[PDB]
Design a protein around this ligand. Sequence first.
Ligand code: CL7
Ligand code: CL7
Ligand code: CL7
Ligand code: CL7
Ligand code: CL7
Ligand code: PQN
Ligand code: SF4
Ligand code: SF4
Lengths: 136, 658, 35, 29, 147, 147, 30, 80, 132
Amino acid sequence: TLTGQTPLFGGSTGGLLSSAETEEKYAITWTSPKQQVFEMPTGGAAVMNEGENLLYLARKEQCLALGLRQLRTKKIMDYKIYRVLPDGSNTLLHPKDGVFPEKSNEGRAAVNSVARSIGENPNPGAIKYTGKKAYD
Amino acid sequence: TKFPSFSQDLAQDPTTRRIWYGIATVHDFETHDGMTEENLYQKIFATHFGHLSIIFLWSAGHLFHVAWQGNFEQWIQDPLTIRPIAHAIWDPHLGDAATQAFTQAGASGPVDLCYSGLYQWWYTIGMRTNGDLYIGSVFLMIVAAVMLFAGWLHLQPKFRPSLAWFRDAESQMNHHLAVLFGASSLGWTGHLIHVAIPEARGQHVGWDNFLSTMPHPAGLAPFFTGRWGVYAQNPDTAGHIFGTSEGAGTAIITFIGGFHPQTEALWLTDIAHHHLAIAVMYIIAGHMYLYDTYNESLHFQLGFHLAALGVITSVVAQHMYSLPSYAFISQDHVTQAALYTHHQYIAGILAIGAFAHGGIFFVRDYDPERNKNNVLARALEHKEAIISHLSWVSMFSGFHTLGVYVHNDTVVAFGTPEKQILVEPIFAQWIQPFMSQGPGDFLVHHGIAFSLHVTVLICVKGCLDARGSKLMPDKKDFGYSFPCDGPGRGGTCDISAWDSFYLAFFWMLNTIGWIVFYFNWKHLAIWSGNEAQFNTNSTYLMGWLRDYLWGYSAQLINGYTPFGVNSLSVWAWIFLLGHLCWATGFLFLISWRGYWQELIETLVWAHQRTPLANLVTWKDKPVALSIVQGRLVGLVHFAVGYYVTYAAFVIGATAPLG
Amino acid sequence: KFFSTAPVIALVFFTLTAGFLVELNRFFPDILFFP
Amino acid sequence: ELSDLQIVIALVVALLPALLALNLGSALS
Amino acid sequence: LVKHGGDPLVGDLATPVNSSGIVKAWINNLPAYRKGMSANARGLEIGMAHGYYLYGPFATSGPIRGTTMSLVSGVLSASAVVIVLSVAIQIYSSVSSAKPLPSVTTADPGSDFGTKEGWSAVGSGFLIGGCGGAVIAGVLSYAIAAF
Amino acid sequence: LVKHGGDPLVGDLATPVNSSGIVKAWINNLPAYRKGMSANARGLEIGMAHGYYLYGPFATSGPIRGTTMSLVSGVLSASAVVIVLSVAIQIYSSVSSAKPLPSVTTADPGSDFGTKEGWSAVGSGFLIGGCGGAVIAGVLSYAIAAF
Amino acid sequence: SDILPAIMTPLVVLIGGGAAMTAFFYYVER
Amino acid sequence: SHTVKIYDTCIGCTQCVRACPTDVLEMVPWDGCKAGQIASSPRTEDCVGCKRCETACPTDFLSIRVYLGAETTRSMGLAY
Amino acid sequence: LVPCSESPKFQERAAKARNTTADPNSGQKRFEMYSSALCGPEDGLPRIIAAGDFLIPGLFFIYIAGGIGNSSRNYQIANRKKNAKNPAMGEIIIDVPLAVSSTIAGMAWPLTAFRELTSGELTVPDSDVTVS
Ligand code: CL7
Ligand code: CL7
Ligand code: CL7
Ligand code: CL7
Ligand code: CL7
Ligand SMILES: CC1=C(C/C=C(\C)CCC[C@H](C)CCC[C@H](C)CCCC(C)C)C(=O)c2ccccc2C1=O
Ligand code: SF4
Ligand code: SF4
């Protein structure tokens, strides 16, 4: 149930607000080799504890900024991002296939792939009052 | 949240963007969810009745207020010394000093002097008592009641006109030309001949005695047989005093020409003749009476009609001071300046609106296949050319006009005014109601030329590049108004077509500003007798700053001083309000969304974390205004500021002079 | 190399053109129109 | 010069477009 | 007195200003937060306090100041402001769903703010309190002046 | 606008006067009917409105009219009338069982009138409102007269 | 009806503006 | 939300996906191009609209085009 | 509108004149020169009428402008022919030999213009002209 140790951090003002409770937090869980110090995306410096560390952040971009910019730089590529609802529904998002989206993996459909290239997109004059967009 | 009902995209926005974008898109009926062309035209149809009801209740207010609170009677008695009155001031905030100062034009209590030439216009069209006005007012309220009743009935499915009645635009065009324009034109000649001209000639026509009265003794006999001669009777003597028997003629249709000397206005008889002629021509043309696109696109239609009303209101302004058609309006300098500046600025708004809807057409309605090789297709075929040419004439006219003005400034500063590049307007002399066009007038004309060029440069680079460009090939995809394409390709801020309307509004204001600046400085010079001042000082830019802006500001800005208030207090204050509003536009034009969004994040934090205050919370997550809303609010502030500042200045410049 | 570079090339050229026009104006009096 | 009778009638008339504006507005919504 | 973060991931820092004992005592016992008050009571106290406070700027600073009529201005002005706040509470409550969340300063805010019932109660309180406040302050101003 | 009968067997015709939108808007949003008000609030608004209105006939028309004392008459008279209505509400509620039934104009009347709890709440409101109304109207009459 | 200004102005600006702002508030928050 | 559409001319450089700060984009296998990949946009409910993807795409008439609409909490990028 | 000599205002201006150049006579020389041109009676300030006034200095201006334009064009041709990559040290760094050759071939643009106009050498086909 998305259990880790909270990185040693003195607290900030940059953290979760009412929306964390009311709507949806996020959580990034990563495995640290050492007890090294990392920039908290909320603003500040925290020290990740040895082993599994869990961090409750307020939006996905905050989580993916810790991950992509700082953790991956420290060569820690074990991080998993969970959308946490108020009920406690923890849902893995970022490595949904377990593989970083840059690396092509099977069982991942082409989503919103468009056959026609940018050039060939229809003029809106033609499609006026059909309710179809140019890209659609 | 329900609002806006029409757009679910927005209605599900959890932020304050939902309220702003709602109000912003609440009249873009095209873009409403589940809006079929049929319902679109029907909705539009009903709205128009709303608009017209507004215009009538507006006019109604004019008449009601002038009746109830005006000095229209006292003014008809002494129309050259009595200041005409717009409405009462009730303001609990005025001090005794300010009530005294606004107690003007022999009004018991505090009033606002009128500066729309409404008194003059009404005297000219025959109204002579507060009763005539009060009846005009109550009438116009009832007209508006009828127009509202109409829009209601129409949208009711009983009388809901189907797509047919709107698809019949050709019929509407012919009808507009004749059944509306022609008919109303000669109806208006009806009014002129029956009421205007009589009341001008000192003879009271009421609604109850005009059935009794005949305009022309020889009237019926001339009608249908030898109409031209009988109608051209004894012309009104120069001696004639407006609204008196003295020197009263009997002619109802004439071609006397020039101006009535007492009122320095076009002869009512000449106007009646004009309108009769206009009516005949219009009705004849009606009887006698890009097609694809114009009928297809309502944007093309408005665009065309806005460009139309653009030129029309420009010419109305140009003609209504040169060729005054209202009694005593030529002598009322503040009113004439006010009306010119008013109509010219409205001209510039309608013009730029034309090009705006132009660009909207080019991103919503224009199908390149539909029209294979139309004017529009050819226009886009060589955009780069139309733009390079407009660019060139802009850089040319600009470089040279600014260079010459700066040359003149430099040499005059250095104390050698001889060396000025004074170019005489020869063609103006050739063509020439017309006022002496000197080398000042030449330079300003070229300024205005250049500025109008850059305006059209911008608001065509807009409507042409709307479809796309090398920086953004597919703009039509993203539409008319959108922030940017992001910092992607060296950066794409202000790449939309809406952005071109935005960038061109500035030039429109610059252009009309140069126009009305020139108008008002020239006229203040002549109205003070120092036409020399204009002629000598208009050739270098310090002369405009020192003599026009600096010089004519003094009265206005002394409207209130530590010593006291005068009648110009309210204008001095508006003058500052317009400077503030203008500058506030810079807040939004210069500071862009991100700065604010960070700041507002911190305020959201502080609110949530402040005891007692945290008890209340927003329904709508506060966010900084959008990129485009920033531009729009910027521009509305800048524009409103520009107009209010200049209106204050026009009034305050001219009022003390008279 | 420095000479080739726009800033120095232009600096010399315009310090020449500007001086040239200054010298012209120094010698010939105020010329408003071609005589 | 404008009597109270007249001011009142003007108001009462103006009330008519008011009601009808409410009606038309509702319609257009 | 040191800054520390309760639930460090939450964007709040216990400080001597938000989490001190003296502060928690005051804040948590103000009628917004004080335990065991009917919402009406919360409002009546908030109202009385504000009406009474509001009388002063208006009476002292306004346009007819110094005159006897200034006291009447003060009271009516403060009452007008309270009526406007009463409207604000009603319309706020009408459209509000949100509940006061537990904070550093106030661990148990309560429900009196956070239910439409609560806000209506508070508003009825606030109105009666506020206009009462304002009247009391004018009465006392007249009283002390006379004495 | 046409007359039609919702549930034609019921003796209630929808008319432009009882079922129009403008009317339903007004009626259903008057404090008797307006949704999401505490009964106390309903009463406080009804009271304030009536007290304030009631001041006028009494101050204007009564026996000591014109005099300064007329303002005091107005306020006390209006307050007396409100006290009598307060009594009426109490005794009415005491013996009332009946609930406001859904009508053409008001589909959801509510329970604030229709429960003894509701009427007591409304009456407390109505009393405070009414006497407040009346006092406010006298205060404003003195204010405007002075100004 | 000399006083009609002193009634119509507060009615429209304060009372009508208030009621308008209240109504628009309900309208955009419901 | 913002619709992210990937057009025919995707040369599968994986530049976009490494750019996206909310990882809306997954490099999926595709036989259309020599690259053997294309860009897919499953998670467009997390598209903030930064267009770092478009900025990173090297193809003329970039294949990745983001279309901003129906702003949500997740689009608008609100912590709160 | 009237010869400066004739205009009495101009004579007033001439009497009290500011010397531009060091030499005391610059003011008088300037006014003497300006006497030829026509000036407005009230102002007494030389005016410019759209041949001596505008046409002649127009021609001189156009010659010089054409020269500098042609020289730049010629140097651009030199850039695209000197090296496979024109911009690098062709624009940022100015080849003085190429430039001086371009200038020498400049100021001959009037004679050159006839040849350039013939066979539309200057103009590049619409088809070629890159436009999205
Ligand atoms: C009843 C006829 C009437 C009309 C048609 C009318 N006024 Mg007045 N009116 C004013 C403006 C005005 C405008 C801009 C206007 C134009 O539509 C009108 N009026 C019109 C201000 C000068 C002043 C402000 C106080 C105040 O506004 O007075 C109340 C005015 C009312 C009952 C007239 C309402 C009728 C108007 C047709 C409504 C117009 C609606 C509009 C078309 C819709 C679009 C809205 C727009 C914002 C986008 C005022 C007065 C006032 C009165 C009175 C009695 C009136 N009026 C009366 C009218 C003040 O005492 C009082 C006065 O005495 O002040 C000393
Ligand atoms: C100013 C140039 C202009 C004109 C004259 C004009 N339009 Mg457009 N125009 C419309 C119709 C229209 C009509 C019927 C019409 C009539 O002549 C015009 N226009 C005219 C609709 C099709 C469409 C709907 C617009 C839209 O939906 O309208 C809703 C916007 C509203 C409620 C808010 C407007 C607020 C004002 C800006 C600021 C007023 C300031 C005020 C004085 C206060 C001062 C304080 C004090 C000191 C005095 C529209 C478009 C639009 C634009 C733009 C830029 C324009 N326009 C421009 C113009 C859209 O993008 C936009 C669009 O959606 O393009 C995609
Ligand atoms: C609209 C243009 C305007 C502006 C911008 C403006 N005034 Mg005036 N203005 C005043 C001040 C003022 C300030 C400070 C100010 C700054 O923004 C402004 N104004 C601005 C006052 C002198 C005057 C009185 C207005 C007046 O009395 O308004 C009521 C004032 C009150 C409710 C606010 C008091 C704020 C509190 C003190 C804050 C307390 C903080 C506290 C530490 C928190 C902790 C508490 C606890 C926990 C310890 C006023 C006037 C008045 C007017 C008018 C018409 C104006 N104004 C007009 C304006 C009076 O008639 C009227 C006039 O008669 O002038 C004499
Ligand atoms: C008992 C004998 C008696 C009778 C029958 C009687 N009076 Mg008198 N009586 C009066 C009128 C009156 C009327 C109209 C009337 C009719 O039946 C009577 N009386 C009748 C007033 C002149 C005077 C005032 C009494 C006083 O002011 O009483 C208060 C009046 C009020 C609360 C009722 C006002 C009614 C509302 C306006 C109705 C409006 C409804 C509205 C349209 C609905 C829509 C609203 C909204 C939705 C828009 C009075 C007197 C007074 C007395 C006395 C002793 C009497 N009376 C006596 C009587 C005063 O001293 C006292 C005295 O001072 O006289 C000067
Ligand atoms: C009949 C049950 C009853 C009793 C026993 C009672 N009151 Mg009440 N009662 C009051 C006093 C009082 C006193 C001092 C008192 C005992 O000493 C009582 N009451 C007792 C006043 C503070 C207060 C207002 C004045 C009040 O009504 O009369 C003043 C009290 C008197 C002289 C003392 C005599 C005791 C009587 C048994 C009470 C008479 C109440 C009667 C039902 C109404 C008579 C007509 C009335 C319109 C004046 C009051 C209320 C009120 C009611 C009601 C319904 C009552 N009562 C009822 C009672 C109001 O709503 C009404 C209400 O406004 O309050 C919520
Ligand atoms: C100042 C500023 C802001 C901040 C300004 C904001 C957020 C507007 C501030 C709110 C104003 C004061 C009104 C909002 C509150 C009203 C009380 C709402 C009443 C209407 C409700 C019923 C909806 C921007 O957001 C911005 C965005 C893009 C470019 C420039 C700027 C910019 O300059
Ligand atoms: S508008 Fe703002 S976000 Fe867009 S390109 Fe310009 S700077 Fe970037
Ligand atoms: S759209 Fe651009 S970044 Fe995305 S996969 Fe294709 S080439 Fe790579």
